[PDB]
Amino acid sequence: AQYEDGKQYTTLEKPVAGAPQVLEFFSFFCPHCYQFEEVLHISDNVKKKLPEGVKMTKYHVNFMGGDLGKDLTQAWAVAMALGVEDKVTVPLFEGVQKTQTIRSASDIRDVFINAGIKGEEYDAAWNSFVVKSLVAQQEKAAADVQLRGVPAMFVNGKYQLNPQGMDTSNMDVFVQQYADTVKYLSEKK
Template sequence: MKKISYILLSMIIVFTVSSAPFQENKQYETLSKQVITDFQVLEFFSFYCPHCYQFDTEYQIIKTIKAALPKDIKIARYHVSFDDVIGYELTRAWIVAVALGVEDKIAPLMFTAVQKTQTIKTVADIRKVFIQAGIKGEDYDSALNSFVVKTLITQQKKVAINFNLKGVPAIFINGRYMIKNEGIDISSKEAYVKQYTDVIKFLLNR
């Protein structure tokens, strides 16, 4: 009787694993150590990254995720500079955008300026993007030079190190799972966006 029960239990476990909608090391991977953050969904990106540009403008992954997930799910986007001078300034500017609540306005304009028109050469050029988005120059300057922005830059850099970040775009779920972009269905734009969102939902509930 015990042997039969063991066989049935084994069958249930095998069925549960095989019937899981997504597979570890295919659509996602589990980190060796969980990173404690304030956010359930955390994206690392760079305005210099062509794939991040596609992610944001063509696939609109984060916008779709925000619309699909419950409002109480905390989502954040961290800009990565990889020790580049202008990249660092873009990181500062992005934190300002978050602080002012204008990420949705700034992201497409900044991506266009960096990737398409290539007009971001100096700190002044970055400031112009905010003015283009309707932000007063003095408000931008005040936020940029605030203690909060300086503190957040340090904090976000530490988080990237803790995740052992090696490239972007990278999305982490609950500080424990990382989406494997190469494992997502690429048969169509719609399929890619849908599966990406479904994988995130799946991992949030693990």
């Protein structure tokens, strides 16, 4: 497709050194993310359009979710370390926006246990330094890229994607165009 700076994507003047290939931010407390995750399946589409060698990274923000928003950021880090992020993505989104049963950190812990993660193992990771540093990096990245919206994707910490500069007439096009822009930027610099 056609890609021009200022419309589909925008190059940041302040690049993030040592940033991953595909960085995406989201929050289970944000319905805007649920729409991009389940309705549009942006992440899923991108993961398949990305060439071999490019890994994706999904971070949780702390400015969306009130107080418990921070707790879920820590929980998400554990999911990433265990490798059950995708598996818990759906139940976490549902339990926060649909059922809204997840009110405390104890509720989040239960989700992991139900998925198949032992409480002891989870709790051990919950109190692990590895996870703590992951939480810090999650917010640090967002603060470095000057995150304005919750659901946003950054390629190599240099190119920022703009959804307001794409097709807003056909959902199919938007989803494909977005992922196409990501891939172009990934195979760019």
